[PDB]
Design a protein around this motif. Structure first.
Motif, short mmCIF file in Angstrom:
data_model
loop_
_atom_site.label_atom_id
_atom_site.label_comp_id
_atom_site.label_asym_id
_atom_site.label_seq_id
_atom_site.Cartn_x
_atom_site.Cartn_y
_atom_site.Cartn_z
N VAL A 119 -5.36 2.99 -0.74
CA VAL A 119 -6.23 2.73 0.40
C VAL A 119 -7.43 3.66 0.32
O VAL A 119 -7.30 4.84 -0.05
CB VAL A 119 -5.45 2.91 1.72
CG1 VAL A 119 -6.32 2.53 2.91
CG2 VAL A 119 -4.17 2.09 1.69
N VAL B 156 -8.55 -6.71 4.66
CA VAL B 156 -7.75 -7.93 4.63
C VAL B 156 -8.51 -9.00 5.40
O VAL B 156 -9.20 -8.71 6.38
CB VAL B 156 -6.34 -7.72 5.22
CG1 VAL B 156 -5.57 -6.71 4.39
CG2 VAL B 156 -6.42 -7.26 6.66
N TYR C 221 0.80 -1.22 0.00
CA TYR C 221 0.00 0.00 0.00
C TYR C 221 0.84 1.27 0.00
O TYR C 221 0.31 2.34 -0.34
CB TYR C 221 -0.95 0.03 1.21
CG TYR C 221 -0.24 0.19 2.54
CD1 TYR C 221 0.28 -0.91 3.21
CD2 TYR C 221 -0.11 1.44 3.14
CE1 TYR C 221 0.92 -0.77 4.43
CE2 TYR C 221 0.52 1.59 4.35
CZ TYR C 221 1.04 0.48 4.99
OH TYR C 221 1.67 0.64 6.20
N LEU D 131 -2.96 2.37 8.66
CA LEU D 131 -1.95 1.94 7.70
C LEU D 131 -0.86 2.99 7.53
O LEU D 131 0.29 2.64 7.23
CB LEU D 131 -2.60 1.62 6.36
CG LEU D 131 -3.04 0.17 6.13
CD1 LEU D 131 -4.17 -0.23 7.07
CD2 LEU D 131 -3.44 -0.05 4.68
N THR E 253 0.75 -3.87 9.77
CA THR E 253 1.57 -3.49 8.63
C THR E 253 3.01 -3.90 8.88
O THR E 253 3.45 -4.02 10.03
CB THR E 253 1.49 -1.98 8.37
OG1 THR E 253 2.00 -1.27 9.51
CG2 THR E 253 0.05 -1.56 8.12
N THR F 136 -9.37 -1.80 6.19
CA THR F 136 -8.11 -1.08 6.09
C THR F 136 -8.38 0.41 6.07
O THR F 136 -9.03 0.92 5.15
CB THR F 136 -7.34 -1.50 4.84
OG1 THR F 136 -8.13 -1.22 3.68
CG2 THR F 136 -7.02 -2.99 4.88
N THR F 137 -7.88 1.12 7.09
CA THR F 137 -8.06 2.56 7.20
C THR F 137 -6.74 3.26 6.95
O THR F 137 -5.68 2.77 7.35
CB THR F 137 -8.59 2.94 8.59
OG1 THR F 137 -7.61 2.62 9.58
CG2 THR F 137 -9.87 2.17 8.89
N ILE G 287 -5.13 -6.85 12.41
CA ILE G 287 -4.47 -6.29 11.24
C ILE G 287 -3.13 -5.71 11.67
O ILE G 287 -2.96 -5.27 12.81
CB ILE G 287 -5.36 -5.22 10.55
CG1 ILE G 287 -4.80 -4.86 9.17
CG2 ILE G 287 -5.49 -3.98 11.42
CD1 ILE G 287 -5.68 -3.92 8.38
N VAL H 284 0.53 -4.66 4.02
CA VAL H 284 -0.53 -4.87 5.01
C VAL H 284 -0.97 -6.32 4.97
O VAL H 284 -0.97 -6.97 3.91
CB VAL H 284 -1.72 -3.91 4.77
CG1 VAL H 284 -2.42 -4.23 3.45
CG2 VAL H 284 -2.70 -3.96 5.93
#
Length: 1006
Positions: free
Chosen positions: A124, A230, A68, A249, A109, A244-245, A107, A74
């Protein structure tokens, strides 16, 4: 990873890897059953680019992580077990050096050691965790999925079947809209019902191993694909993704950036000091001091990223820097130089859009500088740079300055991937061309007026581009070698009395007899038991240099294979290909666009062909049904004692010059495939034979072919051009061959094979004769008007004979003019003069009355075919000599029997002339005669006489003889204006017990 069993499984893999008919951007893709019926259409949005997801994750299944940001990926938090992962091709590996876990959600990264150049990071979504924002009828209109977990298939009855993956691969598809839960932080969808149409035509249910796989949604307002989730968990009915924000991220990339370095224009140059031990440094300007961190010990994650702002900033490196995973991003034009010979290496360099960075610091041996960003980076170091360049975006200008002693090298090697970037060569000393590499999706190599020489073309796919956009013409020499002699090692070993353990092809030297031998086996017997054998040894000459060369030739030959180039040759370039080492064959399945450029081949074989479609997991084969059409646009292709194939799915536009016994084959079956096509590995050449069934897949050529010195030409598929043949051979077997330009045949043979069809619209000239074989059609025609449809322009054709075989057909029509005799022998040929169809060709040229005489076609030869039919429709036929025909059906035509002075004959078994005109000459005692033997028909025919001497008052010359009992009004005398007066012959008709006759007896005057 569970998909419908009623849909061909290869679709779910091509959808995953963006292969087949699922290339990014493609719209309205229909999806069909195994039986062929329509399941649904991929019309809600264009095809998405899944390259941001991993093609390989080492010990982890593919698709676990998703790029990303240029350096960050991610995945789901519970995913773990691998530090290496790949993008584009499996070989393009990257290393993770740091992780950031979300304290509340499943989640996380991860940071990579270098910037990914092979693919573009995913976007994203701007929305983030909004409850119900991903529901149906909302902002997003389509949802795509990709992953490489445990693969199953399932039929409508509910029976599930596992898929044999061999090693594991990516499978993708569609999912339904998503409901939110956990305060909008996670989204879910009932994907277990594969055959619910709400899940899309390529419905996916995700199993173990699909954890952390991406979820994409098409934003219908911003009109672009975005990453929204994800995979975290699943259930018997559906799956659950973590949203996914951008808020989370972006946390890890921001925490790895030091304070922004703002260059103040007025103040001094940015001085950059760095303590390599303990990984700390500083950048000072005036009275402001910026902190900077690099690699500390073995921790590459200790290095942090730098953002440079300002305009025309200057930075001087006072110490060598290993920034670890930290990369440099420039938001403005900058100049960076070393002080004494200091080097910089790290995560890479990002040049933002519309920025230019002057890079004058060298690299480090064993390390590759990763360059990304749409900006431009000009490498302007001094001396040799021991180290690599990996470019993935923007522009990189190679301008390395010479050493104090002359040594120069911009990079040890360069790699161009993703299709985005462009590399420009200032001079030809920047990089060894053999160390230039095109990777996943390739890119542009800008020669910029320089000349390069390759011995290998490390081109991964069609994205490889070699161009020259300078006004100075570049000359690429492709002296391709599979095994260079300079790199061969030949030690001179000794033959031991007792025993030998060795490798084949090795050199051995017997001390006693003093002879040189090449070993053929893995072992040889003691006591000289096998020397004077002929299966484990190969004798070579006594000269020490002579034997070693034979060994080097054997290694070069055995290691040899045909050469293949998948890339493009475009721009202002000339390409020279000499005799290639080993197997002297070169095949191109890419594009060529050289408007003023030339390509030359010396000896061997050159092949232009289309490219077979690459499918996921499969290796291409010449037996495939689906091929990509490739365009080869040249100005001139020069062949020097070589063989050229224009194979299937190849469209060529350009002239061909063959000489010294060259062989040109337009519509060849010989093609070549790559076993490792689409993998990024070295080329594995395989020779095959492929024949296109339908048109459009057949080769198509346009241009003028020139043949010299016993050269050959074979026209097997669509052709539209010209021929200048000198002492050469032309063979036509195509069914839609058209001569666009002039066809010239000086001491050359034009032969139409059986079933061939050729139409020459611009005249034929041959010192010899033309051969039309069985079932073959030859047609001569005036040049069709470009402005007016259906209008033609008269064109003369000169030939020393036209030979028709049984069932052949020769036609002249629509402003065609031919001075050539025609021969058919005992065979049943068919000569057509004029156009049979109504609405025939018209013209506006003044040559209609001047040259065409008002007729649709003219022939000045003589027909010699006693078993052949001649059809004349508004045509003119000068019969220079005696002619024989089986039948003659003429309508509204004219026939002039005689030559000048010498008297000819026209013998037909069957005659059917309507409104036709016949012309004979007479010396008042003998004349040209028309002779009908079996049957006569027609009415309203006119007969004209041309008196060489002055017409006598009374004569008895037989002009026409017809079968007994034929109508006497078939032929009627016609007035001809002679000497300011009108002269008209008078023909009396005499019925006889043998044949009806028309006899000239006198004339009229007024």
């Amino acid at each position: 990873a569970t998909v419908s069993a009623e849909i061909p499984y290869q679709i779910f893999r091509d959808f995953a890897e963006n292969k087949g008919q699922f290339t990014p951007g493609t719209t309205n893709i229909s999806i069909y059953d195994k039986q062929g019926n329509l399941v649904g259409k991929l019309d809600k949005a264009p095809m998405a680019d899944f390259s941001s997801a991993t093609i390989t994750t080492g010990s982890l299944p593919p698709g676990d992580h998703t790029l990303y940001s240029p350096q960050y990926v991610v995945t789901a938090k519970h995913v773990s077990g691998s530090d290496t992962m790949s993008f584009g091709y499996a070989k393009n590996t990257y290393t993770a050096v740091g992780t950031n876990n979300n304290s509340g959600l499943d989640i996380k990264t991860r940071r990579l050691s270098k910037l990914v150049t092979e693919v573009a990071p995913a976007e994203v979504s701007d929305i983030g965790a909004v409850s119900g924002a991903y529901q149906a009828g909302g902002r997003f209109t389509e949802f795509y999925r990709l992953g490489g977990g445990m693969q199953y298939v399932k039929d409508k009855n509910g029976n599930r079947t596992q898929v044999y993956t061999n090693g594991g691969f990516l499978v993708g598809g569609t999912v339904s809209a998503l409901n939110s839960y956990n305060n909008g932080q996670m989204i879910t969808a009932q994907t277990g019902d594969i055959f619910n149409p709400a899940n899309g035509p390529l419905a996916n249910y995700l199993n173990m191993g699909d954890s952390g796989s991406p979820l994409f949604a098409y934003d219908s307002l911003q009109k672009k694909w975005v990453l929204i989730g994800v995979l975290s968990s699943g259930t018997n009915y559906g799956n659950n993704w973590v949203v996914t924000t951008q808020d989370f991220l972006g946390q890890q990339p921001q925490n790895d950036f030091d304070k922004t370095i703002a260059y103040t224009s007025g103040e001094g140059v940015l001085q950059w000091k760095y303590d390599a031990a303990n990984g700390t440094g500083t950048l000072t300007q005036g009275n402001t001091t910026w902190d900077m961190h690099g690699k500390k010990g073995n921790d590459l994650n200790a290095g942090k990223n730098l953002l440079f702002t300002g305009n025309n900033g200057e930075v001087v490196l006072q110490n060598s820097v290993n920034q670890g995973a930290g990369y440099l991003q420039f938001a403005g034009d900058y100049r960076v130089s070393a002080l004494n010979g200091q080097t910089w290496m790290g995560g890479g360099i990002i040049t933002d859009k519309g920025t230019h960075v002057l890079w004058q610091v060298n690299g480090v041996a064993g390390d590759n500088l990763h360059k990304t960003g749409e900006g431009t980076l000009t490498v302007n170091g001094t001396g040799v740079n021991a180290g690599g360049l990996k470019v993935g975006d923007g522009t990189v200008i190679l301008n390395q300055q010479a050493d104090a002693d002359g040594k120069v090298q911009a990079f040890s090697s360069v790699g161009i991937a993703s299709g985005r970037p462009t590399v420009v060569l200032s001079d030809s000393q920047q990089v060894n061309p053999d160390n230039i590499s095109w990777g996943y999706r390739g890119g542009r190599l800008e020669l910029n007026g320089n000349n390069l020489t390759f011995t290998r073309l490390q081109a991964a796919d069609y994205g490889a581009i070699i161009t020259n956009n300078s006004e100075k013409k570049s000359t690429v020499t492709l002296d391709l070698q599979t095994l260079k002699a300079s790199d061969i090692n030949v030690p001179v070993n000794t033959v031991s009395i007792f025993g030998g353990r060795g490798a084949p092809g090795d050199l051995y030297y017997d001390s006693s007899t003093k002879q040189y031998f090449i070993l053929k086996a893995s072992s040889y017997s003691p006591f000289f038991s096998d020397l004077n054998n002929s299966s484990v040894w190969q004798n070579v000459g006594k000269d020490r240099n002579k034997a070693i060369d034979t060994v080097k030739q054997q290694k070069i030959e055995a290691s040899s294979q045909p050469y293949m180039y998948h890339g493009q040759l475009n721009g202002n370039m000339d390409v020279n290909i000499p005799q290639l080492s080993g197997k002297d064959v070169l095949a191109l399945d890419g594009s060529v666009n050289l408007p003023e450029g030339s390509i030359t081949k010396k000896s061997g074989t050159l092949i232009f062909q289309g490219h077979p479609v690459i499918h996921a997991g499969t290796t291409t084969s010449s037996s495939q049904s689906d091929w990509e059409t490739r365009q080869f646009t040249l100005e001139k292709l020069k062949l020097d004692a070589a063989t050229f194939h224009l194979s299937r799915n190849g469209k060529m536009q350009g002239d061909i010059n063959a000489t010294n016994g060259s062989t040109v084959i337009l519509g060849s079956s010989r093609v070549f495939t790559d076993r490792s096509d689409g993998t990024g590995n070295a080329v594995s050449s395989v020779e095959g034979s492929a024949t296109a069934t339908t048109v459009g897949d057949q080769s198509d050529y346009s241009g003028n072919v020139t043949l010299e010195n016993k050269s050959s030409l074979q026209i097997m598929e669509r052709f539209t051009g010209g021929i200048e043949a000198y002492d050469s051979t032309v063979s036509v077997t195509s069914q839609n061959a058209v001569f666009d330009r002039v066809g010239s045949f000086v001491n050359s043979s034009l032969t139409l094979g059986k079933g061939a069809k050729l139409t020459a619209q611009s005249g034929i000239f041959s010192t010899g004769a033309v051969d039309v074989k069985e079932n073959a059609s030859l047609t001569l025609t005036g040049m069709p008007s470009a402005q007016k449809q259906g209008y033609y322009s008269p064109v003369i054709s000169t030939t020393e004979g036209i030979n028709l075989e049984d069932n052949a057909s020769f036609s002249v029509k629509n402003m065609g003019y031919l001075s050539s005799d025609i021969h058919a022998g005992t065979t049943a040929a068919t000569i057509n003069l004029g156009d049979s169809d109504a609405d025939a060709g018209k013209t506006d040229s003044p040559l209609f009355s001047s040259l065409m005489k008002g007729y649709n076609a003219v022939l000045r030869g003589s027909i010699t075919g006693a078993q052949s039919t001649v059809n004349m429709i508004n045509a003119l036929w000068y019969s220079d000599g005696k002619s024989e025909a089986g039948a003659l059906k003429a309508k509204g035509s004219r026939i002039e029997l005689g030559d000048g002075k010498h008297f000819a004959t026209l013998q037909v078994k069957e005659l059917s002339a309507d409104n036709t005109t016949f012309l004979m000459h007479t010396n008042n005692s003998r004349a040209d005669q028309l002779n009908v033997t079996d049957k006569l028909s027609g009415s309203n025919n006119s007969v004209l006489v041309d008196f060489l001497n002055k017409p006598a008052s009374e004569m008895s010359v037989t002009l026409i003889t017809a079968p007994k009992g034929s109508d006497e009004k078939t032929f009627t005398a016609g007035t001809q204006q002679i000497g300011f007066s009108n002269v008209t012959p008078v023909i009396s008709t005499e019925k006889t017990d043998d044949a009806t006759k028309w006899v000239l007896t006198g004339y009229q005057t007024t």
